[PDB]
Structures are given as structure tokens and as C-alpha cells.
Amino acid sequence: LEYSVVFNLVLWIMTGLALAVIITSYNIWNMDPGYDSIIYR
Amino acid sequence: SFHCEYVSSLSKKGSLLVTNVPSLWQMTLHNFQIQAFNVTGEQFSYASDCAGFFSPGIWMGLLTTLFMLFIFTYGLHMILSLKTMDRFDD
Amino acid sequence: TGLELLYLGIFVAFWACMIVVGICYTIFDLGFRFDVAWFLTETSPFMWSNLGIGLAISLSVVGAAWGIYITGSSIIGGGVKAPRIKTKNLVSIIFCEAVAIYGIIMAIVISNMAEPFSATDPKAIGHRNYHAGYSMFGAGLTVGLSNLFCGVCVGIVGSGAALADAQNPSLFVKILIVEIFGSAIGLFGVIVAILQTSRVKMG
Amino acid sequence: NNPEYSSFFGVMGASSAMVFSAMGAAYGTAKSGTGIAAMSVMRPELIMKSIIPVVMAGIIAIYGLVVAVLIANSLTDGITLYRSFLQLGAGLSVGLSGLAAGFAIGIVGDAGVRGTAQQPRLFVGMILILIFAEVLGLYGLIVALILSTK
Amino acid sequence: NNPEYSSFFGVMGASSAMVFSAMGAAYGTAKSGTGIAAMSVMRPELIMKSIIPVVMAGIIAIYGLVVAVLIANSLTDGITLYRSFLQLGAGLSVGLSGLAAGFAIGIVGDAGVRGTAQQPRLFVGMILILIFAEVLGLYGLIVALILSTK
Amino acid sequence: NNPEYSSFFGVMGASSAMVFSAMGAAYGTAKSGTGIAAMSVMRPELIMKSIIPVVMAGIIAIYGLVVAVLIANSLTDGITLYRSFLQLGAGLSVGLSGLAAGFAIGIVGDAGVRGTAQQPRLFVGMILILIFAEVLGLYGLIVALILSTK
Amino acid sequence: NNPEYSSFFGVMGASSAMVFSAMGAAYGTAKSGTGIAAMSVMRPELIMKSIIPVVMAGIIAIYGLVVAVLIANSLTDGITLYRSFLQLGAGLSVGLSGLAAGFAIGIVGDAGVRGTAQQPRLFVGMILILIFAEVLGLYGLIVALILSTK
Amino acid sequence: NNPEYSSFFGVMGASSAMVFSAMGAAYGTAKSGTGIAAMSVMRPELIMKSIIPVVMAGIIAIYGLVVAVLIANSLTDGITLYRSFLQLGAGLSVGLSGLAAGFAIGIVGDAGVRGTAQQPRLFVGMILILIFAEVLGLYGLIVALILSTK
Amino acid sequence: NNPEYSSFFGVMGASSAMVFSAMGAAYGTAKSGTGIAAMSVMRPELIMKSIIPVVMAGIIAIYGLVVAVLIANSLTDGITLYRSFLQLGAGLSVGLSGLAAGFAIGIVGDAGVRGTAQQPRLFVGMILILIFAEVLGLYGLIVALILSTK
Amino acid sequence: NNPEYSSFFGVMGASSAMVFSAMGAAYGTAKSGTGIAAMSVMRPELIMKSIIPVVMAGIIAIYGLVVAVLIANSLTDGITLYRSFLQLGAGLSVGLSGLAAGFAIGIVGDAGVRGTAQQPRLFVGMILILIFAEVLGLYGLIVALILSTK
Amino acid sequence: MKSIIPVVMAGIIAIYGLVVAVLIANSLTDGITLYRSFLQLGAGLSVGLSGLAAGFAIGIVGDAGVRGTAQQPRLFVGMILILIFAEVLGLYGLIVALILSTK
Amino acid sequence: FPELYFNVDNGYLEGLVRGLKAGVLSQADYLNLVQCETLEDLKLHLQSTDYGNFLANEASPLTVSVIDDKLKEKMVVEFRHMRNHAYEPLASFLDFITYSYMIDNVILLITGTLHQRSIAELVPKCHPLGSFEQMEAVNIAQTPAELYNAILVDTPLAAFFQDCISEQDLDEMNIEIIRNTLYKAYLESFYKFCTLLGGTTADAMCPILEFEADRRAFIITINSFGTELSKEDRAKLFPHCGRLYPEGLAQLARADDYEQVKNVADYYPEYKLLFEGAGSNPGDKTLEDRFFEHEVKLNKLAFLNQFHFGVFYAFVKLKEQECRNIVWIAECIAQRHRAKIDNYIPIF
Amino acid sequence: LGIIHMLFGVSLSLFNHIYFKKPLNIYFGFIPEIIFMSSLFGYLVILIFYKWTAYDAHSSRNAPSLLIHFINMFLFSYPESGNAMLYSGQKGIQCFLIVVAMLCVPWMLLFKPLILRHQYLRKKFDFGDTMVHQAIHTIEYCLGCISNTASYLRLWALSLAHAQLSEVLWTMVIHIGLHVRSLAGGLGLFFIFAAFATLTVA
């Protein structure tokens, strides 16, 4: 018993953590590196 | 067949046994397993468990949460789409 | 980009998992799970009823707000060079607000149908009572989304009318017929929700 | 008798019938109305011809209404599960075809009024192209009547 | 004998035959109708020739309708479960092949109509290409007829 | 007596009433503050008049507050699911309505502020359009006052 | 003896064989029609000779049909699940290979046709790269025949 | 009687108050700090006044901390689900109201600060709209104090 | 005895070997034919020697055919899960390694052909690069032969 | 005695405290380092003052380490769910408040430094703004310490 | 020859991953106690994803820092100072991972 | 579907710019301006419409140069006021409009430094839309090589220079080849950028840019036949985003006579009609004037869609055509040569 | 190794401040800095050597974990339970060394700024600027103690990686060169080791 509760804890906590990692990782990986002083020379 | 962790009259163990009236009796079948038609040999067939991936309380919960997260996402998509001017007038 | 990839990623991962689950429950012979009957029966009728009531408002109000922001922004943007716009074109705002009022009427009617069952078992609840819960959800969702689309429609065509009026005033009354065909959609959402509600009783 | 959840699919029939036809008719009208209003500045006389895409998108809302009325007048707590699925088929089949017709009407109405304002000879072509768009709502209605009244 | 829910698959058949054929025909009509509308400003005489894409998009709608009517008249209260799945198959087979045919009639129609206004010789080429777009609907229909009557 | 989870739906009700109306009023205030900034550089005297869409966005979040307080004062452990779902209904109904009205106040506010700056005849027009936008928040409030007291 | 759901996979075989091949042929014909249309503006003579990318997309549509009829003619009540999985694998194997071939015929058909206008010597190259695109539909057939008749 | 797992909701309450209030105050600060540092190059005298959006962003995080502490010091092993959900409701209700206020403080901070350098009169206007952005965090607090004390 | 579903994974293995390698060889052909066709206007003679990327794309589909045949001939109703899983692994291994080889052959073939058009020396280089692409399909085959024969 | 599997959330608390604060500090460091690097070309003397946003970003990773270590030291196989959740919520509270603070530190570091090179008076302002960005991590830590030790 | 530093600072993140991967892998067994197995998960994520955070931190400040250094040689010291507070994120993932792996 | 977001940020300016387009001279207004005898009558007519008071606080010995500059002043204040308001999805698009003037300012800057003239002397000649954000290039002016390096840092134009202009090319190339090769890169990039703004913006902006690409191809070709530009140079300047790109451009590169250009134009009805529409006969409208008439047709058509940024581009080009019309009328009035005055292009 | 070289580093600081005649730096910096470091490090190093002598295979069952006692010492939070203590009176030693280290920070942070304030008031720069700089330096040294200690784990990390790369290269390349006949194995090993040597160099 409680197995639907264990599962809906672990599934949704892990999907929340995995989205927080994925979104943050996507945001930093596609962050502007900002080297405008040389990108044109 | 059927399997359950606690066919019991106690709330601490799921309250599967229900009395509509006061009772002098209590019971618990820890890991209860039963099969009573189309049995073969002395071996149980595959068991449906009393606990699946979801429950009535969880479906009501998710059909709210994973509905209002659609609505909060609309909130979040418009608020995150706020912008500001890069210039101001002469 | 990022939010589109997030919504696409969730949508794809969700439906890919429902394909894998649908195949796996089928081929393992677990058709005694995936019991949609259990889902619709043990999920409380009060939930369906109240999602119906709250959506009948909020989706109608989401439509009417979308409608107001669209036509009201062109009204103001054109009204800079044509101050006459602010009066006649206000009908496109009043028709957006009518779409919310269609929502409020229909949600109050559905709310007046909601009652306590005092029951916690499917046979004790009984068919009329599940049928109330679902038909109240459906009525509320029908009006709610029909008004959402009607509000999006009225504001859009009201922006059309106000930007045309800013260029030639004689156009407004001639164009304004399109907002009537828009506002018909919300009214049809109300007529259907009335009929879906007309037979229910909770208790 | 029938199961308690029986009427759920039939309710989603009536709701789909109207909502997707409201979505169709709203997009068909919204798109067409932008065309009409923008076009009318150049050619103010053309409004009474150019309303026809909007009347067509209004007919799609009527198709969604017709099937939703017939389904709602055919709902009861006592409904057999077989009829309740047919009512869902009917509601999707008009609703999403009404949506498909609304999309076409909206796109061709806007292009059609814009073309017409430069070249009035397009008007016969526009009416033909709108007939071939709006008839998808009618096919959605035919299939939905056959399901909902069976 | 059979699940009371069995008809649900055949009902999603009838709906999907209609709906996805309507979405095919709607896209075929929207895309080529936009082409006809813009085109008719330069070559007004071509309206009553350039309509052929739209006529064939209507034919994909007709294929959806044929199978959706065939399924809907072939459904019954106690339908045999595999006979219900055959009807789902038929409905997706014509419905989505109709959608695919609609996609080709749409893009071929738009490009072929604009191209024909640039090039009077293209008309025969466009028609041959549209037949190779519209026949996908017909193959969708052949499979769906065979399945729905197996 | 009542189910263990029962009070949760009323709780999310109270939360949504405040959160969603907060998001709406936040957007309302952010758009209006941007419009005020781009307006003030040219028309600094106008600020005390151009505050109207901001204070109206702040009023939208009071409609959320009022319901979130009413729901929260109505909670208890022993709550029946009927009262709990009525309170979730009050929650989304004010919540998303306030959210939507906040979006209309923000966008109409930013325009109305930038428009009034160039054309003083619009100040009353902006006030009127925003009154329609505020009334959409009031409708959410009316049903949420009904549901939370039912 | 055999499972209830067994024929659903056999059906998904037939349907997929058709639907994904129609999608492949539709994409092949949509890109190729775009290319032929835009090419023909300065090349009357090529309108007939250039239709070969379309004809090969029409063959992908037949590879779908062949497997879909071969599966459909072998569906029945008693199907032992194993034969239904074989049929699903056949239907996906031809279907999605038809989709891949259709993608490739589209891209090489567009680019190849445009290039053939610029340089008529390209035409033999366009045939060779198209044999290598069309044969993916044939491999899709070969596997599907083997599976559906194992 | 009290179940296991009760802590999750109350704990996610405490954490959500802190996390979303910190996200709010981090967006409020990031936009304001961008505004201040892009602005101040032309106006050194405004640095020690244009900090106010950042101070108000800090206060949203304090409302978060208040509720997160008030929840964290009111958890117990085997807490009843009613108090635990109330602590979730309080948690989200300040946390997300702080997030919303964080967006508003950010935007009025950026636009109001940058605008001030070209127009000093805007600063008092920016303070007032920034109180209207800040006070949503306070409505979130008021609801969160209420829920956590039922 | 062994589970009735066991053949499914082997069949999805066979399908996968064909499907994912057809997707690979299609993409490799599509990009290669684009590059060849775009080259031809400037270098009409190189279009024959530049077939080689397409031939290697074809070879990736032949590897996926081989494993799809070897899997498809190795199936029976009673197939042990151990063996069916080997076949699924084999299918994905050649299939996705063929897709990987296809992405390589395409990008290398396009850039290599359009480079060789401008630079007659590059041919000797790009064939070595294409070999280091196509060998991925051979590694996939090797692991698929190894898996399917345990 | 009490539930097995209880460890999972406590362990996830340690990981969340570290991972998200390391993401915060990485973003903070990264964004700030682009600022320092691009600035240094114009002002080769400001390098050693300009490190402070990088240092404060590093301190966010220290806060996540402090909680992660405190959690890990407080784990046991027999951990009551009350302590296990308190550890998860502590983990997310610092982890994500540190992420928020890291976002703020990255943005105000970069904007502060690029502004400071154009006007050295901003340096004090960048420090004051940055204290309000960094204290969010300290608040997250406070709640995490209170939770994990409750 | 100087600007290789960011590559080697990224290089240590793989090695921090390897240290924990090896430590976990040697500590596995048939029927491992769940508690010891979750500890190994938490370690494995904590290094792996802090390594990932440090990987991005090094990538961005290495790309900007090397470019900046070629325009201004004085940045060489600022760059390697920045690469401390970048690469230390990999180390903190290691610290917690070792603590968890031996708890 | 785009309508349903567009007015969130652009709704106000969309209303504003259509309102500003209502403030243009109709065909009847041009037919009134030509009725007169002196520039004082141009003032008195324009006083009845949106340009009123544009010659208040100005000297009584009025000149056509003052009317030209004051009409440009109104056009540029009407545009600066929108650019200062627009948000990033539109603000990048309005900046692409300004590039059609910054290219010419860069040619003035390059021409000044090649002639060693101080760049600050040319700032008053540069078009006001093409204002550089950083004047430090202008303040330094030290060498052409310094100007090149300074442009590549100070200006967001740098990404176009990197594709077509090296420092050695900047000295070796003729400035008119630099002007056109820049415009090739701009127009192809602005087209690609518009195809990212999908739906209505692409669908009703792209025809104008597709035409400008073909207009450039024809006009560059016919003007090159008496000149140093080889077959390769014409091809190198033609913009590849026009309808003619697959074939027509290649035939125009091969061309050496106006009959061969007409043969290319005779494949496309849209262009066949321009070459039939002007034979360059005595008293005829020129081929260039037919392209200006067609450009006005396309810009008018862009106002017939609602929710798109195409109206901001079509507005700037129509106000430019209006300035050009008022100045041409004012020249025919001031120079007394009213016989040709009808050569203005009607707009609405 | 890292602890000892950091203890040398603070000792090198003492010499350098003496050669610049800076009594303030040795008094307010070096003394509390070495005490902070030495109290934390000394406990840890003592425990490491003690474990290697105080335990064996017999005492290995239920043997105490060193890192836990080290963390608990810094937390001031051993709960009288869980792991057994390592030696008699160790609780007092934990309490003493951590409290002594915690008492170092105020001297380093504030006491030098206060003396510098009174020197500049009597000799008749700012107090706040001095406080900010000295606080930052103090905090960087103290947080650096933890971080820099852990940074010496790079030693181990690299040493493992080198060993495992070497082990894999041997097992993948050299092992294949071994054969059951003298001539075949002798020819195989020659080319196998040349390929191996190339990979070891790279």
C-alpha cells in the first residue's frame, strides 16, 4: 500500500528536478557569451 | 488472483474492512492473497495488486495540479514575455 | 524558443509515454488496469462540477480579456490620429464584455444546480448524480471555451473595425456586422450549455 | 442497466461539437473580419459582397450548435454505453470538421477579399472556394447526424 | 460475447475518417485558395481553370465522407471486437491518407497555380502532379474499404 | 468521517485566488510601469493621471486577496468534498479571471499611457476601456463570493 | 484461445503501411511539385521530363498500398497475436521507410529539378540519386512482405 | 488518524515560499540591477537613489523567508494532512505572489530607473508604481499567514 | 511456456533496423542530392563522380535491410524473451547507428560536394571522411549480427 | 519499522542543495566572467576589483555545499519520512534559492562591471546591488538549515 | 600554449566524474542495501551535474577569457582567477559525492 | 494565430502607424497642389493637412531645399517616435529599415576618409535615420583602416561588413561597388529575417523585398552596359532573394544589351508590364518611374493585411515617396516647368 | 600533503611580514590564521594517523568512520550516539579546537581596522574601506581553508585517472599480443607494443 503515493512522489519530484536541471542547463548552454569586442574582427 | 498488503479494520493499515456499526472485533491480513475461481493446481495465478500507480485521491489531486499548471503556464508565458524599451525619446 | 521547446518536449514525452503505456498494458494483458470506468467512477463528481463552474467564468473572462486587449490597443493606437474613434468603437469592448456576461450567467445557472450528495460509494451516489457531475462539467467547459474563442474573435474583428474607422469614419457601421457574427458564437456556447444543464439534478 | 459513467462520452460529444465549431467559426470569422476591415478602406462598396466568408464561418457555428442540441436532447443518466460513444463520435466528427472548415474559410476569406479588392472577377472564384471549404462542415454534419441519431 | 465498449474504436474510425479527411481537404483548399486569390490579380481568366486543386481537395473530403458513412452505417450495439478495430483502421487509413493527399494538393495547388500564371504551359504539368497527389486519397480509400468490409 | 485529502482542494483554491490574481496584477503593473516610463520622458506632468491602470491592476489583486481570505477562513479538517471543490472553484474563478483582467489592464494600460501622452483626448477613453477590463475581474469576484459562501 | 486485442496490432499494420506511405508520397509530391512549378517559369520543355520525382513518390504510395492490402486481406477473428505483431512490424517497416523515401524524393526532387533547369546534364544525376531514394521504399516493402508472410 | 508522508505538502510549502520568493526577488533584482548599471554611467548622483527597486526586491524575499520559517518551525512527525496542506497553500501563496511581484518590481525597476536619467520627475512616479508592485508580495504574505495559522 | 507478447520486441527490432536506417539513408541522400544539384550549375562534369555520398547512403539502408531480414527470418510464436530482446537490441543498434551514419554521410556529402565544386583537390579528402562516416553503419551491423546470433 | 525507500528524498535533498547551487554559481560565474573578460580590454586595471560578482557566485556554491553536507551527515537507513522530507525541502530551498541568487549575481555582475568600466562611480552601486542578489542564497540557506535540523 | 588552461580546467571535471564513477562502481553488489544504493545515486548525480555546472562555467569564461586575453594579455591572471570559482564547482560535486558514497 | 499575440506589445504602434499613414496626400491632394503658381501656395495647401505649421518659424525667402529638409524632418520625427517605443520583436525590424540609410552614410564616411577629409564635416550630410549610436569612429577619424576597425565595433552593421568587405577591399574597390555589395548582404539578410517572422509579416513583407531584389537586378543590369562592370560584377551585385534567382539573374549576368534584359523581363508578367509600360519615348514615363509606381502598388497592398510589421516598412517607403512627390511638385512649380508635373507617383 | 603545504604557506607569510616590518599583520593576521588552520587541520591529521595504528582486521567490524567524526567536530554536534568515539576525552578536544578556531575570526576581521582608526585619529584611507577590505580578506582565507583543503583531492583524482588509462591501454592492446607459440607471440608483441607506446605517449 502507499505505492501510488510513493510513485506520485518520486515521479513528480523527479520530473520537477529533471525539468529544473534541463531548463537551467538549456539556459546556461544557450547563454550569450558576450564577446562583441572580437566577434566582428 | 488478488493481492493486498493489508486487508484490515485499522486505519493505520488502510481500513479496507469497513463496519457501518460499532464492533467488538478487529482483523489484519498482512500480504493477503486470495484466488477462488478457475484455480489450477495449488499455485496462485498472477495477482492484481490492491495498489496501482494511482488512487482516487491522487487522480483528484493531479487533475487539479496538472490542470492548474496549464493555467499557471499561461500566466508564466505572458509574464515572462514582458519587455522594456531599449531607447527613450528626444 | 525555450518555452516552445519546453511545451513541445512535455507534449512529446507525455504522448510518447502514453503510446508506450498503451502498448505495454495491452500486450502484457493488463486491460483490467487502465480502468477508465474506475477513473470516472472514483474521481469525485464534485470535481467535475466545480471545474465546470470555475471554467465557465474563467475561460469566458480569458476570452473577454484577450478581446479587450486586442481591440482596446488598436482603439488607443488609432485614436491618437483620430480622436473620434473612442466612442463608436467602444461597442467592440461592450461585445467583449458581453462574452464575459454570457459566462457569468451560465456559471451562476450551473452553480445553482450544485448540491451535496452525502454519499461516498458509486452505487450510493447513483447514475443521476454522476450524470449531473459530468453534464455540469461539459456545460461549463462548452460555454467557457466557446466564449474564449468568441472573445478572441470579437476583439480581433473589433481591432479590424477600429483601424479601418481611423482611416474612413463611414466604414464603422458597415464593418460592425462582423462583431455580431462573432458574438453569435458565445451565444451558441450558452445555448449548448443550457441544454447540457437542463436535465441535471444533484442529491 | 447502463454504467454510471455512461453519459461522460456523450457529454464530451455535445461539448466537442460546439467548442471545436466555436473555434472553427471564431478563427474563420476573425481571420475573414481582419481581411474585410483592412480591404474595406480601399474599396468601401465591397463590404456587402465581402461578408460572405463570415456568413460561411457562421454556418460552421450552426453545425456545431445543431449536433450539440441533438446530442444534449439525447442525454440521460440511463443512456446505454453504445449510444454514448456514438454521441462522442458525432461531436468530434462535426466539431473537428467544423474546425477544419473554419480554418479553410478563414484563410480563403482573407485572401479572397484582398484579391477581390484588386480584381473584382475573383468574386465567383471566392464563392466556389468557400463552397468547397464550407462543405467540409456539412460533411462533418452528415457523419455526425448519422452517428448521433443512430 | 463482446465488450460493450468495443464500438468505441469503430466510432473513432468513423470520426477519424471524416475529421482527418476534412483537415486534408481544408488544408488543400486553404493553401490552393490563397494561391488562386493572389494569382487572379495578374491572370483573371485563370480563375475557372485554377480551381482544379480545390475541386480535388473536395474529393479527399468525399473519401472521408464515404468511409465515415460506411463505418457509421456498419456500427451496431453489440459489435464484434475485431470488427470494431477494422473500422478504426479503416477510419485512420482513409482519414490520414486524406490528410497526406490534402497536404500535397495544397502545396502542389498553390505552387502550380502561381507557376501557371507565370507559365501558361504548366497547366498540364500541374494537373498530372495533382492526380499523383489526389490518388493518395484513393489508396487511403482502397485500404479503408477493404478493412471496413473484411 | 470525510476523506483524508478533502481539505486540499479548498487549499489550492485559496492559493490560486492569490497567486493568479497576483500574476495578473503584476503584469498589469509591469506593462503600465513601462508605458509610464516611455511616456514620462516627454510628458512628465502626466504621471499622476497615468497612474490609473496601475492602481486598477492593484485592485485586481485585492479581488484575489478577498477570495483567498474567504476560502482560508472557511477551511477545516472535517470539510466535506462539496465545500472543498466549491472553494477550488472560487479559487480558479477569481484567480484566472483576475489573471486575465490583469492582462487586459496591462496591455490597455501601456497603450493608454503612451496614447494619452501624444493625444490628451484619449485619457477618458483609456479610463473607460480599463473600467471594462476591471469589471472582468469583478465577475470572477462575484462568482467566487457566491461559491465561497455556498 | 487467441487474445481479444490481437487484431488491433494487425490493423495498425495495415493502416500504418498506408498512412505513412501516403505521408511520404505527399511530402515527395509537395516538394517536387513546388520545384517543377517554380522551375517551369523559364523552361517549358522540362515540364513533362521533370515529373519523374513525382512518379517515384507515387510509387512509394503503392508500396504502402501493397502491404496495406496484403495485411488487410489476412486479418481475421482468430489471429494469434504473433501474426498481428508481424503485421504491425510490416506496416511500420514499409510505412516509415516510405516516409523516409518520400522525404528524400522530396528534397532531391526539388533541388534536382531546380538544378536541371540551370544545367540539363544534371537530369541523369537526378535519376541516379532518385533510384537511391526510391529503393528505400523497396527495402521497406521487402521487410514488410517477409514479416507479413512469415 | 495521521498518515505517513504528511510532511511532503507542508515541507514543499516551506520550500516553495522561499524558492519562489527568491526567484521573484532575483528577477526583481536582475532587471533592476541591469537598469541601474546601464543607467548610472550618465548619472552618478542617481546610484544611491535608484537602488530602491533592488531594496523592494529584497523585501519580497523577506516575505518568503517569514512564511518559510513560520512553516518550518510548525512541522511535526505525523502532522495531520489538513495542517500540512495549509502549509503548502501558505507556501505557494506567498512564494508565487512573490514571484509575480518579482516580475513587476523587475520591470518597473528597469524601465523606471533607466527613464529617470533622462527625466528626474519619473523617480517619484517609479516609487509609487513600485509600491503597487511590492504590495502583491504583501497580499501573498497576508494569505500565507492566514492559511498557516488555521 | 514463454509469454505470448515475446515476439513483439523481435518484430520491433526488424522494423527498427529497416526504419531507422531508411531515415539515415534518406537524410544522407537528401543532403547529398541537394549538394550535387546545387553544384551542377558551376561544374556539370562532377555530378557523376559526386554520386558516391548517395551510394554510401544507400549502403546504410542495405545494412538495415540485412538485419531486418535476419531478424524477420528468426521469429516463432514461442520465442523466448531473451532472444526477442536480442532482436530488439540488434534492430536499434544497426538502426540508430545507420541513422548516425546517415547524418554524417549527409552533412559530409553536401559540404564535401559543394567544396569539391570550388576545389578539385578536396575529392580525395572527402572520400576518406565519407568512409569514416559509413563505417558507423558497419559498426552497427557488427553489433547487430553479434546480438541477433547469441 | 518505519518505511524503507525513505532515504530517496533525503538523498535527493543533498543532491539538490549541491546541484542547483552549483548551477546558480556556474551561471553567476559564467555571466560575470563574460563581463570581466569583455570589460578588461577597455580598462585593464579594473580586473582585480571586478572579481567580486564571481566571488559572491562562488559563495552560493558554498551555501549549497553547507546544506548538502549537513543533509548527508544526517541521513540513515531508518530515517523517518519526517526527517527525509525535511531534508528534501532543505535541499531545494537552498538549491533553488541559490539558483535564483546565482541568476541575479550573474546579471548584476555583468551589467555592473560593463557599466563600471564606463563610469567607476558605479562600483559601490554594483556591490550594494550584488549584496541584495547574494542574500537570497543566505535566506535559502537559513530555511534549509531550519528545515534539515527541525 | 597558455590558452590551453580552460581546456585542462574542463578536463578535471571528467576526472572528478571518473573518481566517483569508479568509487560507486567498485562499491556495487548483487542485493546491495537500498540505503547504500540511493547514496550512490545521490553521489552520482551530485558530481555528475555539478560537473556539468562547472563544465558550462569553464566553457563560457574560457571562451570569453581567451578572446579577451588575446586583445589584452593582463586578462590572463583574471581568467585563471575566474577559472578557480568555475572549476571548484566540480570539486564541490566531488566532496558531497565522496561523503554520500561513504555514509 | 499571430493576431492573438501581436497586439500584446505592438498593438499601440500598429494603430499609431496606420493613423500616421492616414496623414498622406491623396490623389486629389496632389491634383490640388499642382493647381498653383508659387511655393507660398505649397505652404497654403499643406497648411490644410498634417504637415501644417512645418514652415512656421522659418525665413520668408523660402526655397525648395527648405521644403525638402522640412519634409524629411517630419518623416524622421514620425519614425524616431515609433523606434523609441517599439519592443525587441519589432525594434530589430525597424532597425533593418534604418539600415537602408546607414549604408549610404557608411559610403559618405568611407568616401570622406579615402579623401582624408574629417568625418565630422560629413555628419550634417548623412541621412538622419542613419545615426550611428557611438560617434567615437567619427571623433577619431584618424585613417580609413581606423574607420574600418571602428565601424566593426561601434556599429551593429559589422555583421554585414564581415561577409563582403575586407580592409584591403575597402581601399581597392570603387565606393559604388561597396554600396551595392553591402545592399546585397542587407537585402538578403532582411529577407531571411522576415521569413523568421512567419505568417503575415513574411507573407506580405516578402513580396516587397522580393521585388526590390528583382528591381536591383534589372536596374543594375541596364545601367552597367556602358561600364567597367563585367558579367561577374553584375552577378556579384544581384540580390539572390528575388524571383529571378534560379535563372533570370544568370541570364542578366550573361546579358550585354537592353533587348536581352527585356527578354528576361518578358518571362514574368509582373515585369513584362513594366518594360511594355515605358519605352523611354519622347514625352513617355521612364522605366525607373514604372518601378516607382510598382513599388507604391506593393507598399499599398502591404496595408491590406492587419497584424504584421510590414506596415512600418511600407509606411517609411511611402512617406519617402510622399517627400519625393512634394519636392518634385515644388520643383515643377518653382522652376515654372509645369508641363511634366504629373510625373509624381499617386499614393494612399 | 595539502595541509602541510598550506601550513608552510602561512609560515612563509610570517617571514614575509617580518621582512617588511609589519607587526599588525603578524599579530592580527598570522596568529589567529595559523590557530584557525592548525586547530581544524591538526584534529583531522591526528585522527588519520591514529586510525592507521589504533585499529586492525579484528577491530574492523563496527569501526568508526573518520569523515563523520570530522564533520561532527566542525558542527559541534556529535549526538552521543551512532559511531563510537575513537579515544578517551575526544569530546573535550573537539569542543576546544572548534571553539578556538571560531574565536579567531573577530581578531582578523575587526581588531586591525579599530587600531588603524585610532592610529589615524592620533596622528594629527577610511575606517569603513579598511573594514570592507580586511573583512573580505579574512572571509576569503577562512572559506579558503575548507575549499583549498578539498582542492588537494586533485592529486588522488589525477593519479586514479592515469592508472586506469594505463590499465585499459594494457588490457585492450598488450593482452592481445600474448600467444601460445614462441614465433607467433614474438612477432605479435613487437607491433602490439609499438602501437601501445604511441597511445601511452599521446
Topology:
This is part of a larger assembly, with 1 copy of chain A (41 residues), 1 copy of chain B (90 residues), 1 copy of chain C (203 residues), 8 copies of chain D, 1 copy of chain L (348 residues) and 1 copy of chain M (202 residues).
Chain A lengths: L2 H27 L12
Chain B lengths: L1 E2 L2 E3 L19 E3 L2 E2 L13 E2 L6 H25 L10
Parallel strand pairs in B: 1-5
Antiparallel strand pairs in B: 1-4, 2-3
Chain D lengths: L6 H36 L4 H4 L1 H21 L8 H38 L3 H27 L2
Helix pairs in contact in D: 1-3, 1-4, 3-4, 3-5, 4-5
GO cellular component, one term (chains D, E, F, G, H, I, J): membrane
Membrane topology (chains D, E, F, G, H, I, J): Multi-pass membrane protein
Family (chains D, E, F, G, H, I, J): Belongs to the V-ATPase proteolipid subunit family.
Mind explaining what this structure looks like?
The structure is cut from a larger assembly and holds 1 copy of chain A (41 residues), 1 copy of chain B (90 residues), 1 copy of chain C (203 residues), 8 copies of chain D, 1 copy of chain L (348 residues) and 1 copy of chain M (202 residues). Chain A is an all-alpha fold and 41 residues long. Chain A has one helix at residues 3-29. The termini of chain A are far apart. Chain C is 82% helix and 0% strand. Chain C has helices at 2-27, 36-42, 45-79, 85-88, 91-113, 122-125, 127-167, 171-175, 177-197. In chain C, helix 5 (91-113) runs antiparallel to helix 7 and helix 5 runs parallel beside helix 9 (177-197). Chain D has one domain (1-150). Chain D is built from 5 helices and no strands. Chain D has helices at residues 7-42, 47-50, 52-72, 81-118, 122-148. Chain D starts with 6 loop residues before the first helix and ends with a helix. The longest helix of chain M has 32 residues, at 23-54. With 202 residues, chain M is mostly helical. The chains are: A mainly alpha (41), B alpha+beta (90), C mainly alpha (203), D mainly alpha (150), L mainly alpha (348), M mainly alpha (202). Chains K and M meet through helix 1 and helix 3 of K and helix 3, helix 6 and helix 7 of M. Chains D, E, F, G, H, I, J: Residues 29-50, 110-126 are cytoplasmic. Chains D, E, F, G, H, I, J: Its main location: membrane. Chains D, E, F, G, H, I, J: Belongs to the V-ATPase proteolipid subunit family. Chains D, E, F, G, H, I, J: The chain crosses the membrane at residues 6-28, 51-71, 88-109, 127-147. Chains D, E, F, G, H, I, J: Pfam families: ATP-synt_C.
